[PDB]
Tab-separated table of all heavy atoms in Angstrom:
chain	number	residue	atom	x	y	z
A	1	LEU	N	145.063	104.992	163.997
A	1	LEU	CA	143.671	104.601	164.243
A	1	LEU	C	143.247	103.474	163.279
A	1	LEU	O	142.696	102.451	163.681
A	1	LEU	CB	142.784	105.858	164.054
A	1	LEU	CG	142.724	106.907	165.186
A	1	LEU	CD1	141.808	106.483	166.335
A	1	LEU	CD2	144.084	107.290	165.768
A	2	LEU	N	143.532	103.678	161.986
A	2	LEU	CA	143.148	102.792	160.892
A	2	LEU	C	144.253	101.751	160.634
A	2	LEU	O	144.366	100.792	161.390
A	2	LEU	CB	142.783	103.627	159.640
A	2	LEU	CG	141.502	104.482	159.686
A	2	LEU	CD1	140.277	103.618	159.973
A	2	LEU	CD2	141.572	105.640	160.681
A	3	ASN	N	145.007	101.906	159.540
A	3	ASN	CA	146.076	101.041	159.040
A	3	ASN	C	146.673	101.723	157.797
A	3	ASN	O	145.962	101.896	156.803
A	3	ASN	CB	145.501	99.680	158.594
A	3	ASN	CG	145.481	98.567	159.630
A	3	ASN	OD1	146.280	98.496	160.547
A	3	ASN	ND2	144.582	97.613	159.483
A	4	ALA	N	147.957	102.102	157.819
A	4	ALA	CA	148.610	102.732	156.664
A	4	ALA	C	148.537	101.884	155.375
A	4	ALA	O	148.291	102.426	154.300
A	4	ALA	CB	150.063	103.056	157.025
A	5	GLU	N	148.713	100.560	155.478
A	5	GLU	CA	148.628	99.614	154.352
A	5	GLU	C	147.237	99.604	153.697
A	5	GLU	O	147.108	99.650	152.470
A	5	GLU	CB	148.972	98.202	154.850
A	5	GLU	CG	150.445	98.078	155.260
A	5	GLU	CD	150.751	96.659	155.743
A	5	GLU	OE1	150.811	95.763	154.871
A	5	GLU	OE2	150.912	96.492	156.973
A	6	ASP	N	146.194	99.568	154.526
A	6	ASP	CA	144.797	99.591	154.113
A	6	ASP	C	144.492	100.952	153.456
A	6	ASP	O	143.954	100.993	152.349
A	6	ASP	CB	143.857	99.293	155.304
A	6	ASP	CG	144.155	98.055	156.175
A	6	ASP	OD1	145.236	97.444	156.041
A	6	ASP	OD2	143.336	97.774	157.084
A	7	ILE	N	144.917	102.067	154.075
A	7	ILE	CA	144.856	103.421	153.496
A	7	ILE	C	145.570	103.506	152.141
A	7	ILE	O	145.021	104.084	151.201
A	7	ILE	CB	145.357	104.482	154.516
A	7	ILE	CG1	144.183	105.116	155.292
A	7	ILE	CG2	146.134	105.649	153.897
A	7	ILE	CD1	143.781	104.272	156.492
A	8	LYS	N	146.760	102.908	152.001
A	8	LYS	CA	147.503	102.836	150.742
A	8	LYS	C	146.656	102.200	149.628
A	8	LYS	O	146.647	102.723	148.509
A	8	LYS	CB	148.853	102.140	151.019
A	8	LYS	CG	149.499	101.424	149.827
A	8	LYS	CD	149.955	102.380	148.708
A	8	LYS	CE	149.556	101.868	147.314
A	8	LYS	NZ	148.624	102.802	146.636
A	9	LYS	N	145.931	101.108	149.910
A	9	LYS	CA	144.960	100.515	148.970
A	9	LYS	C	143.731	101.402	148.752
A	9	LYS	O	143.298	101.571	147.614
A	9	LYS	CB	144.556	99.106	149.432
A	9	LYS	CG	145.701	98.109	149.200
A	9	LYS	CD	145.289	96.683	149.592
A	9	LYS	CE	146.357	95.653	149.195
A	9	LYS	NZ	147.613	95.819	149.967
A	10	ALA	N	143.209	102.010	149.813
A	10	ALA	CA	142.046	102.888	149.786
A	10	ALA	C	142.241	104.116	148.884
A	10	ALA	O	141.411	104.380	148.018
A	10	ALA	CB	141.773	103.318	151.219
A	11	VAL	N	143.344	104.859	149.046
A	11	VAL	CA	143.654	106.017	148.191
A	11	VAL	C	143.771	105.588	146.720
A	11	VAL	O	143.333	106.318	145.834
A	11	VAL	CB	144.905	106.763	148.703
A	11	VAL	CG1	145.370	107.904	147.792
A	11	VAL	CG2	144.641	107.350	150.094
A	12	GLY	N	144.243	104.360	146.461
A	12	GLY	CA	144.154	103.705	145.154
A	12	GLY	C	142.707	103.494	144.690
A	12	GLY	O	142.369	103.853	143.565
A	13	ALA	N	141.836	102.958	145.552
A	13	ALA	CA	140.410	102.741	145.277
A	13	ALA	C	139.604	104.021	144.947
A	13	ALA	O	138.525	103.906	144.370
A	13	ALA	CB	139.785	101.976	146.453
A	14	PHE	N	140.123	105.223	145.245
A	14	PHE	CA	139.580	106.508	144.769
A	14	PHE	C	140.483	107.229	143.742
A	14	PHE	O	140.193	108.369	143.386
A	14	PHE	CB	139.278	107.450	145.952
A	14	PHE	CG	138.171	107.110	146.938
A	14	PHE	CD1	138.163	107.707	148.220
A	14	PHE	CD2	137.057	106.354	146.535
A	14	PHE	CE1	137.085	107.520	149.105
A	14	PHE	CE2	135.965	106.212	147.402
A	14	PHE	CZ	135.983	106.770	148.690
A	15	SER	N	141.562	106.607	143.243
A	15	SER	CA	142.516	107.212	142.297
A	15	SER	C	141.946	107.345	140.866
A	15	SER	O	142.512	106.812	139.907
A	15	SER	CB	143.830	106.416	142.322
A	15	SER	OG	144.742	106.950	141.386
A	16	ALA	N	140.841	108.080	140.720
A	16	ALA	CA	140.105	108.320	139.479
A	16	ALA	C	139.479	109.729	139.471
A	16	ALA	O	139.532	110.443	140.471
A	16	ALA	CB	139.032	107.229	139.342
A	17	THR	N	138.868	110.129	138.348
A	17	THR	CA	138.149	111.405	138.221
A	17	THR	C	136.837	111.379	139.013
A	17	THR	O	136.692	112.119	139.985
A	17	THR	CB	137.909	111.754	136.736
A	17	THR	OG1	137.293	110.684	136.048
A	17	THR	CG2	139.221	112.070	136.016
A	18	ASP	N	135.882	110.541	138.588
A	18	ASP	CA	134.498	110.478	139.066
A	18	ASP	C	134.124	109.123	139.708
A	18	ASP	O	133.034	108.978	140.256
A	18	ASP	CB	133.517	110.835	137.922
A	18	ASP	CG	134.097	111.710	136.799
A	18	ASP	OD1	134.947	111.195	136.033
A	18	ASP	OD2	133.728	112.905	136.727
A	19	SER	N	135.010	108.119	139.651
A	19	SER	CA	134.700	106.713	139.965
A	19	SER	C	134.825	106.391	141.467
A	19	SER	O	135.481	105.433	141.879
A	19	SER	CB	135.561	105.793	139.088
A	19	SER	OG	134.932	104.536	138.950
A	20	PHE	N	134.221	107.233	142.313
A	20	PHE	CA	134.398	107.205	143.769
A	20	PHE	C	133.573	106.094	144.446
A	20	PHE	O	132.559	106.350	145.105
A	20	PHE	CB	134.108	108.607	144.319
A	20	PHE	CG	134.589	108.907	145.731
A	20	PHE	CD1	135.854	109.493	145.929
A	20	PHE	CD2	133.734	108.736	146.834
A	20	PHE	CE1	136.214	110.001	147.189
A	20	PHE	CE2	134.115	109.192	148.110
A	20	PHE	CZ	135.337	109.864	148.278
A	21	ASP	N	134.009	104.836	144.294
A	21	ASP	CA	133.411	103.663	144.949
A	21	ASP	C	133.682	103.655	146.467
A	21	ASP	O	134.547	102.949	146.990
A	21	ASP	CB	133.849	102.363	144.259
A	21	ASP	CG	133.070	101.136	144.757
A	21	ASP	OD1	132.378	101.229	145.800
A	21	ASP	OD2	133.193	100.074	144.104
A	22	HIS	N	132.916	104.478	147.185
A	22	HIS	CA	132.981	104.690	148.632
A	22	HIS	C	132.763	103.400	149.419
A	22	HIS	O	133.458	103.139	150.401
A	22	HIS	CB	131.985	105.799	149.027
A	22	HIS	CG	130.700	105.820	148.226
A	22	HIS	ND1	130.514	106.425	146.999
A	22	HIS	CD2	129.524	105.211	148.562
A	22	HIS	CE1	129.241	106.219	146.629
A	22	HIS	NE2	128.609	105.450	147.533
A	23	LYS	N	131.844	102.563	148.933
A	23	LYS	CA	131.544	101.223	149.432
A	23	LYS	C	132.809	100.364	149.430
A	23	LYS	O	133.122	99.768	150.461
A	23	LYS	CB	130.455	100.615	148.539
A	23	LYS	CG	129.118	101.387	148.580
A	23	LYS	CD	128.236	101.024	147.377
A	23	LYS	CE	128.612	101.802	146.108
A	23	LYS	NZ	127.942	103.123	146.048
A	24	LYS	N	133.525	100.301	148.296
A	24	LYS	CA	134.758	99.523	148.146
A	24	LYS	C	135.968	100.154	148.836
A	24	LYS	O	136.728	99.414	149.450
A	24	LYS	CB	134.996	99.288	146.657
A	24	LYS	CG	136.068	98.231	146.363
A	24	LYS	CD	135.954	97.735	144.914
A	24	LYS	CE	134.698	96.869	144.709
A	24	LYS	NZ	133.721	97.502	143.790
A	25	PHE	N	136.113	101.487	148.837
A	25	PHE	CA	137.090	102.195	149.680
A	25	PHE	C	136.948	101.763	151.142
A	25	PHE	O	137.909	101.251	151.705
A	25	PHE	CB	136.916	103.711	149.542
A	25	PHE	CG	137.899	104.535	150.363
A	25	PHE	CD1	138.999	105.135	149.731
A	25	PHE	CD2	137.712	104.730	151.748
A	25	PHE	CE1	139.912	105.913	150.465
A	25	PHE	CE2	138.650	105.463	152.495
A	25	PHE	CZ	139.757	106.043	151.854
A	26	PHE	N	135.754	101.919	151.743
A	26	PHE	CA	135.496	101.578	153.151
A	26	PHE	C	135.715	100.092	153.487
A	26	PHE	O	135.888	99.751	154.657
A	26	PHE	CB	134.080	102.000	153.554
A	26	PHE	CG	133.968	103.387	154.167
A	26	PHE	CD1	134.220	104.537	153.397
A	26	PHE	CD2	133.539	103.529	155.502
A	26	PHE	CE1	134.042	105.817	153.954
A	26	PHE	CE2	133.346	104.806	156.057
A	26	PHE	CZ	133.600	105.950	155.282
A	27	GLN	N	135.723	99.222	152.473
A	27	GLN	CA	136.110	97.814	152.583
A	27	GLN	C	137.636	97.642	152.474
A	27	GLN	O	138.249	97.098	153.390
A	27	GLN	CB	135.313	97.000	151.544
A	27	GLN	CG	133.851	96.918	152.012
A	27	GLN	CD	132.849	96.454	150.960
A	27	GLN	OE1	132.861	95.327	150.500
A	27	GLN	NE2	131.881	97.302	150.656
A	28	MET	N	138.262	98.150	151.405
A	28	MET	CA	139.708	98.070	151.132
A	28	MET	C	140.570	98.741	152.216
A	28	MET	O	141.643	98.240	152.538
A	28	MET	CB	139.992	98.716	149.764
A	28	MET	CG	139.377	97.928	148.598
A	28	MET	SD	140.495	96.754	147.787
A	28	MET	CE	141.215	97.850	146.536
A	29	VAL	N	140.089	99.849	152.792
A	29	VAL	CA	140.689	100.573	153.927
A	29	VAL	C	140.403	99.907	155.290
A	29	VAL	O	140.905	100.360	156.317
A	29	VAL	CB	140.150	102.013	153.926
A	29	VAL	CG1	138.769	102.112	154.543
A	29	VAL	CG2	141.071	103.012	154.634
A	30	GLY	N	139.536	98.888	155.328
A	30	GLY	CA	139.113	98.221	156.555
A	30	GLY	C	138.211	99.044	157.485
A	30	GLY	O	137.953	98.589	158.589
């Protein structure tokens, strides 16, 4: 549905304790 490559960057964009930049995840994941 999405893109595995974009998801690979997205799971990186949340790879923290509390730093959940949902705005940037939804951009990086496309």
